[PDB]
């Protein structure tokens, strides 16, 4: 009943969930055209089954987003049962507000595209704003990196029972708390200004930088300096998306943190040769578990403080 | 060309409102039936009309929505133009989101009611989420207190040019930094573990807490005593929506405030005789002028 | 896969209805903020299964409806495989019609805050207007009183065969001609003008007074006094929803019935200690029935003439 | 700014409407394929124009609902500004509820597929529920032949200060009640066992039948009878719609009606020749009000 | 779980697809009434079934299409689990665009109107227009005739490796190359201009025409007489779908074809007295296998290229 | 009251259309964020306008898709009054149907995301197939280059009055047929079976090929070979679409075309360059006149 289908060619995270569940990847004939279009077909048929597609790591976002789209439709009119989305990181998130400008919600189009299309049900990871859930009228497993996180700070900060939990912008400061209630540890706030402002005290501690994306990495490093001159011991970053487009390896393999953490919502393997400070979390039996958890009617709660 | 009608009871936000702009409030006749269901009449003919709806404050929010969807209904059935609704106050509002539990994300579900009621733009005040404005698919123009509150600040705090614009909860980071940055001073967080944190330097400087609402005031009254405890010299409370219910009035004056500022998106006027030091910013020019703007095409932006 | 929740703490009929499938109530944390908005918490895992949601009977309808579209919605966003509300008597009912004014059709109204919250079918009982059906895209099973009013008649006033089953508005003539019909027996109908008039021979006969609903009870009071006027033995009032605000059980305790028949599609149990006229039928088994047959796919049908 | 088009021949109603409107009723070419199939052309530009499409009266319901359908759809995709459609006699109005059967609601399936097929607006008259007005999400407007019926009444029936208005069914207790308390007379109700029974006192005055439809005129012809056995002094029949299918006319003459009164919302002037007694109220002119007072954002209302 | 229905009386192509699965066709109780508006009655509960509307025979178009959309409505509010219709015929399909008029495209109208009744699938047989399947939102499975046709071709002329497939028109181009490419043989086209054009050679062979419908004949016959004209040894005609209006049966038994093949998505019993060229395959194995296929969610598409 | 915007680059087209209106492009912030992503400010209140976004040219294909959908968006929720979008060539236009495989209609799901963003009103030139009108259900007006393409044959080619218009697939058999027939001159057609096959007389005459798009131009090439040694004496291939990517334009030199003629639907400037033969039709007046026409409720079908 349960067939998984990948995107694109960035099919390691796809093959990764499938091989968990036990499944092979569905047969899908995908190319773009020689004018950019992107062509798909269904190379077996869905009728009746309880479709999933994750979302592909290729980098280019909207040759990534209309294949998706594209599959999504293909599957709906071919009878599938129900199309599940597992887009571990949502597209154009960062874009989910006016900000006092005369700008789209990008997150919201999205949203209402993916809806269009035929999407049934969607599973995520850490979406920017919580509030994104709002944005569908379909159901939305946001799962969370936190426990993983936890996981990771436990069995590799010896000194995590005395770190500090910052966050590198105002936005992200419900996360990091949350984060350092649990650890039962401070945390403190880098806010921007063309300088930047920290409140908390991270005197002889463990800086962890927690947010959940990092891009360009302008800031974390930016933040590692600073966490640095208020006399943190070493610093860490931990962020759930890995994006790193532009002179962020640059950035990176020159900036002061001891290691950052990310987790494999996006591909890393090429970005980690020429970055040797980047170590990666596999979040594949999460996601396995969230979709298996859900063809079954098991409670996928039991991951958003549970590492499967 | 242009109607605008009430609420409940609560009349006077709208009829400033009405005022402004030079009009009389619409012909309603708004009511109770003995079995707690809500009765409308609309006494005169809409047809055609680019309407406005002003919600009320009766004090009682599922029979004040109900209202407003009841309104708004009576009207698109009645043919006129448009619809908007000017909801200074958004209800449910801070259900935005499940937060890990199997919770409702209701005012998505006051969103999708008020959309499918027939409103055809929303114009609100400092929405406690930014991002509820993505519930809707029709426009909504999102209000500010910011430079009201600024304003005043300014014009009242003496020592202004050294205080610090306070967050009561972590969830309120961007809201004070931003307040903090177009005045130029510093600003500090608290947080509860319960035990309450402070991060930020308030020592021998005027605190202002900023929320966007207090209910209880419990969480912003304790926030007074760990500044107070920090050494703060003097403490201000600015809240955007003063929804002051339960406790709330007894404990601002049990508590240290040198005064409690509101802007009356809510009736204060009965609050107001039982409490000296609260303090009103009047809204009303900012919502008129919306209204005029929206209707005119008139650059409405401008406002913020 | 069957789960069964409660509105508010009015709790008496869902559990009567859950007692009888052989259930427990499912779990919710329900209450009203300080300002008055409500709180709702799905206490369990809802997801995948065919959820049901039964009305409260508090009294207070506003707080009622948002309550029961809050659930609703909480369980569509939690996956529930499909909502089915159980409302028994159906809000804002009687206003299903303009009435030549520039009014609401709140009824309709209603129907589509319940359509977008998430319902996926719709279980009540004796819609005041039948056409309220038509107010959704969606199935509506509208269950009768009717053949329990018969059952009821007929083991309780021994001259039923020579009764006469009268309207108190000119607006329920199809229900009572429908009664007497079965019961073969004379009707007859009652009009206000501020004054009424009677239609139809009640000489020398039990009248019983049949509406869907009463609330002030000023016109059963005043349709008792008339029949009374126009030599019937002795008056019944028979009402599938009892509402009975304001003065009515001032009205009924001092009026000229010799009973008022209710059942419990709202709850009685506090008016019946000030207001010894009152009898009440548990219309549970019909509810509970109802649900047992929409969950397997059993003719609910056969509920609208039996009692089961 | 305003364009009238009629139906598929039934011209007379609508060129009459587009008469007192002062315009002439919009290009069209209207036809049936061979194969039984629904042609339309608009045979001139509707684009961001206010359309109105009159109903016509072919006496074939499925032919022209399609036929209305596809005009509708042709002005909706070419740019036309809004699509208002004069339905003086509703499709498939009778069927709005199960009735305890397994049976579809089709006039809200008709309600449906109007909205989808891009009507903005309704205008109808005599609606045989009133509910069905609930089955739009777009606004309705239900004229009502009530006052034409009152005025021809008492101009028409000398004795009509002691006449009594009667229901042919139990399901028309409403609509009589209500013409018999405009008038302050005594009314009168029938129900079918089968065998006819009649409550109200008929004995020694003038009865007027009043239903909304008449079909078969089965049911009015029988309740004819059933009264002049009470001892009516002379029987009348008052419809709105004059459907009048089948043995219907022939049915007419075969009983004892002094006359039978209908409304042009539906051609008689077959169906007049083959029946002497019959008469209409012309009400052209109400929809020609309705029509531009939609237009023009002027009460429509007042026509009630 | 599956219940069949027919429309109206013309029930022969209906009872052959039940038959074929080994079912009755369900009850229902449909008169036209006085006025010439169509009542319809489930005559027993489809509560939770997959039910399926197979279009009926009857030739008027618009009391059809009412009767199939109120079924369709019946059946939806009387909670079945799915309403699919059997359309082998699908109406107003040649309306599908505007050409350069300010014309409505009936066919996306029609395909609106069967999805607010609450279509939830479609089966059809060789749509005017692929692209009608566009016009829809729902899952829709385009049957062809084809295989069957290439199946009557070789089993019925002798000399079908040396044939020609000619186009009466040249919107049908593709579907005539197709079947020429299949079979190995050479295509021909005809163009109107008051005059017909022909390209391609067919001097010596036996001509085919096949097209999708004829409706009136005039078309077809016109054709074979250029075709005649232009040297072929015989004419055939091949449509899917028989139409014949009109003086279609006189034109053709006129006309200079050896036979005219129709499948029975028409009724054709009636016309075939009347005219000895007209031949019918069957085509209710490929009706009944579909909805089969489509009840178990096997694949429709092994019809698409086989016979059943 | 009007206001026109612009694509990503590739603003000529758009350059071109405001300046036959006699208007000024908008003021547009459109770029890339390093991470892929595509970013979007309005740099004016379009509160209360007709608004028209022409579509771009940076010859990727679904970078432009949601370049456009985001300024739909934006100009939606800034109460902009209705939202036209003027794509002269429709993006995934060839993914109109299955064709037999388990394929998307992506045509389908484009039409179903510009409706969804809040696109009001469609303007196109020569879909690729008529039928994608009736993807939307808000209204499209579709022009065609054929009047153009027809004066240029009639223009350009000497020998046109003995001339045949050649289809390059089965599946552009009407398209040429019409040409042809306003022409008053024969037809051809060609399939590939692999080798081409070749349907009509095109011995000693001048070949015009007519496709409303080539992308590879790797099966109209050919379709000029077949045509040369069928003793065309000389071929001529005319598109409404010039997409011309790939081998494209060395595939052109490499052929025998006289000529090859392009609308500007598509930037052309730069592949012009690399092929000389290569000559334009600017349709910018065409769609100047259809969004003026549009916005006048003046007749655009004429221009068909």
Excluded at 39 to 68: A, F, P, T
Excluded at 112 to 121: F, K
Excluded at 250 to 272: G, L
Aim: charged share 25%; aromatic share 6%; glycine share 6%.
């Amino acid at each position: 009943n349960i067939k998984i289908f990948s995107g694109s060619s960035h099919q390691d995270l796809s093959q990764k969930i499938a091989d968990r569940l036990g499944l092979e990847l569905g047969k899908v004939v995908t190319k773009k055209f020689s004018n950019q279009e992107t062509c798909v077909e269904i190379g077996e048929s869905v009728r009746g089954e309880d479709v999933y597609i994750v979302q592909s790591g290729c980098g280019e976002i909207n040759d990534n987003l209309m294949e998706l789209l594209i599959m999504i439709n293909a599957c709906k009119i071919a009878s599938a049962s129900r199309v599940t989305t597992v887009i571990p990181c949502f597209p154009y998130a960062r874009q989910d507000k006016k900000d006092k400008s005369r700008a789209p919600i990008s997150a919201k189009l999205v949203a209402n595209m993916l809806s269009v299309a035929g999407a049934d049900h969607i599973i995520t990871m850490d979406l920017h704003a919580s509030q994104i859930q709002g944005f569908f009228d379909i159901p939305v497993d946001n799962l969370y990196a936190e426990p993983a996180v936890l996981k990771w700070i436990r069995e590799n900060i010896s000194e995590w029972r005395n770190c500090t939990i910052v966050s590198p912008d105002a936005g992200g400061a419900k996360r990091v708390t949350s984060i350092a209630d649990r650890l039962n540890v401070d945390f403190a706030l880098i806010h921007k200004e063309d300088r930047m402002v920290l409140v908390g005290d991270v005197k002889d501690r463990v800086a962890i930088l927690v947010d959940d994306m990092a891009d360009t990495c302008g800031t974390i490093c930016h933040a590692a300096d600073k966490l640095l001159s208020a006399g943190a011991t070493r610093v860490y970053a931990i962020l759930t998306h890995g994006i790193f487009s532009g002179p962020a390896i640059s950035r990176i393999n020159n900036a002061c943190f001891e290691a950052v953490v990310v987790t494999n919502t996006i591909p890393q393997e090429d970005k980690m040769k020429h970055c040797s400070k980047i170590q990666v979390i596999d979040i594949s039996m999460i996601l396995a578990e969230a979709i298996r958890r859900t063809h079954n009617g098991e409670s996928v709660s039991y991951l958003f403080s549970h590492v499967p």
